[PDB]
Design a protein around this ligand. Sequence first.
Ligand code: SAH
Ligand code: SAH
Lengths: 393, 392
Amino acid sequence: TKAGSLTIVGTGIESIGQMTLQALSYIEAAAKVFYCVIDPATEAFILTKNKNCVDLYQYYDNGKSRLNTYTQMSELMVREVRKGLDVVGVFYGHPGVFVNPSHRALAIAKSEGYRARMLPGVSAEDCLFADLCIDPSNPGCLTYEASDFLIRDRPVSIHSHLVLFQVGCVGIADFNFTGFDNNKFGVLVDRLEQEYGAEHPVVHYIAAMMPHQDPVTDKYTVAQLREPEIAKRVGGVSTFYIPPKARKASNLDIIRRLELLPAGQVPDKKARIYPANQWEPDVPEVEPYRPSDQAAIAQLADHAPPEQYQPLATSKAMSDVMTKLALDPKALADYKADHRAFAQSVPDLTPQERAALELGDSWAIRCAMKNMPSSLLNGFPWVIVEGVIGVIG
Amino acid sequence: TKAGSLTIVGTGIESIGQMTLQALSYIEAAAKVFYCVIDPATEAFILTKNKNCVDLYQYYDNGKSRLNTYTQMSELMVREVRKGLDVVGVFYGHPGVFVNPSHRALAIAKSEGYRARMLPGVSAEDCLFADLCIDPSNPGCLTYEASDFLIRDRPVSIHSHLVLFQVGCVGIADFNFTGFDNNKFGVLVDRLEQEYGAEHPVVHYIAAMMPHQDPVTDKYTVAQLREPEIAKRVGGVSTFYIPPKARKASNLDIIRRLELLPAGQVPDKKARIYPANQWEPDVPEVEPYRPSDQAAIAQLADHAPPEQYQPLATSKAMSDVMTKLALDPKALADYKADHRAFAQSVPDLTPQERAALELGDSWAIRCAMKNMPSSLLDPWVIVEGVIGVIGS
Ligand SMILES: Nc1ncnc2c1ncn2[C@@H]1O[C@H](CSCC[C@H](N)C(=O)O)[C@@H](O)[C@H]1O
Ligand SMILES: Nc1ncnc2c1ncn2[C@@H]1O[C@H](CSCC[C@H](N)C(=O)O)[C@@H](O)[C@H]1O
């Protein structure tokens, strides 16, 4: 009902390319854009997309409490919302991951009755999984802010992934344009030594911020983080990844209750699905082509789509409108305001395509765009299986 | 050196719009595209961008081990890599987050000496943070596969976020086109009851997969997950978010070693930065405009950029080439092959812009594109988070 909206979007980490299509489309549609980005190529890119941009980075200052900066950044965005403008806030990475002012501005906007939405983006942790070739699923992931990790004595699991953000500003509440003397870094290393031992690997991770750069994926021992030459390499964009030290055994009660029953058949806790985490100390070599793998590959020769497989069967007109709804926020708002009026003005839709848009139901749109076989009559693509379940079945 | 490459990219969760610009650019540049997506609008979008696409979803079947499907998906991609083609694999969300065949195909390609890269994408957990309006930083985040959670008895922290994926197929190794009777769901609820109590909230989260849909953000008690009508709502795209039950106290030793020293000034462990996590039980209302907030806002009237602030000062030619390097993988490969030849063929660059590209160094490119004031010269600095005890 109320005039004025706040949409907060991300740029991702790597310059320009890690922005989502929808983030770009909201930046272009905005009446005003407020941005806080790392790299000048992303900044320049944003300014080519909207004529009314404000750099939020100017509200940092030497010795200025970051909390005061964040209150100011939030208020600049919400002031424009209250004047009835469609406002877009733009932050580095995912705009909600280790970001104070986005959450603050969205909560204020929401509480005063304005439309308020955060669109997800690619985080430094998303980059970490991709560059270190690890899956948070295998074997679970603990993610902490490094100072919070220490002050609140957050628990570590030696059996799961550990990721630490803001390791380059331990205990630091303020800002400095030339970066920080991270003098309390030794307090973090002491905790890592207690939890994992002095010989356990820590990966210094820096995602490439420009398209031509390589990531930093430097493995050090906990002990090596005490060498002054190495400690000095940790900066404001540094993240730590600590791999598991050991593998956790199966709970026989759960094995029974999940009927993975022939107990002898459950893989040894040391048995891995290819590939193994290469960062783990004493990483055993895992066979990519076991007899089960070779037999599955042998079946490819005679493979045909199962009877229940639903081939795409759509039209340019339907693909075009579904693309427009994703990439044109004004078209989306019009559609959400009046499904029927919008659907009836789309040129070249089949009667089924028109009907499907009029309803808006997932099922109607899926039947309109996929041939549903008689054999078949939500989505079900699971692309991971836990090893003990997989190897048994 | 070797002909043939594997790039694995994501589509994000919400149809089309949550694909990154670089994922799209690799899908367009590929010799062959293998995709596994949820929604037909994303599938149709991909097929308009490349003429040589294969749907990997056809390798699932009723009663067929998902592990066998994943071996087949991986091998289809690596076979094309081995024949010297630039292959792009496309998976929904982040292609490395709860995805077996991406990691497998990349490891095989890498081990046989081919170029192999995963590009990050927007995960269901990225969507969860955005839609539930929570920050994994406040107060830390534990992320598990629901079956792994149970079988390996993974630890919970009652003080931090808990996220559980694949809650709709507990203990299930196979596939069914019509979905599953999630009959072992009650085993997960038993564990959540032990760890948090029967009254503690669990958020049933489903990200909107189409641009017009609303997310499902339904809060239930652990006990309510036992009602058959509610348990039945949990499906293949369901994720659980379990909020913290309590707030963790500060370690006085670390307070001393980090010189947050005037101990009386450290906020009560109950004190929160606005806003509070709305999903927490007994969430105390937090004042958005404290006297400190009002004083910071009062300072906006007389605000000027600090002297050390670096205004953007670039050219169309330089912004164009930096955009081309991000959005044109063939232009990027050419640049990476020969900085100098590439830099010297870019039209309309200033001598500084040309020199900066020739070197490739971050600093050279930053000076070329930003006015660095004398005050600054006498590292990338962008910290958008501060925890409560430090900040106050
Ligand atoms: N290029 C990079 N490589 C690795 N970690 C990075 C990074 N840039 C930022 N980070 C991490 O993020 C912290 C800043 S908090 C801002 C995070 C951003 N919203 C995101 O989605 O990731 C840094 O201290 C570091 O831990
Ligand atoms: N629309 C959606 N909303 C919430 N969770 C979802 C989802 N789609 C998938 N998921 C989660 O992802 C699991 C499949 S595993 C694949 C995850 C995907 N690679 C990603 O990046 O998120 C599901 O069981 C569920 O836990």
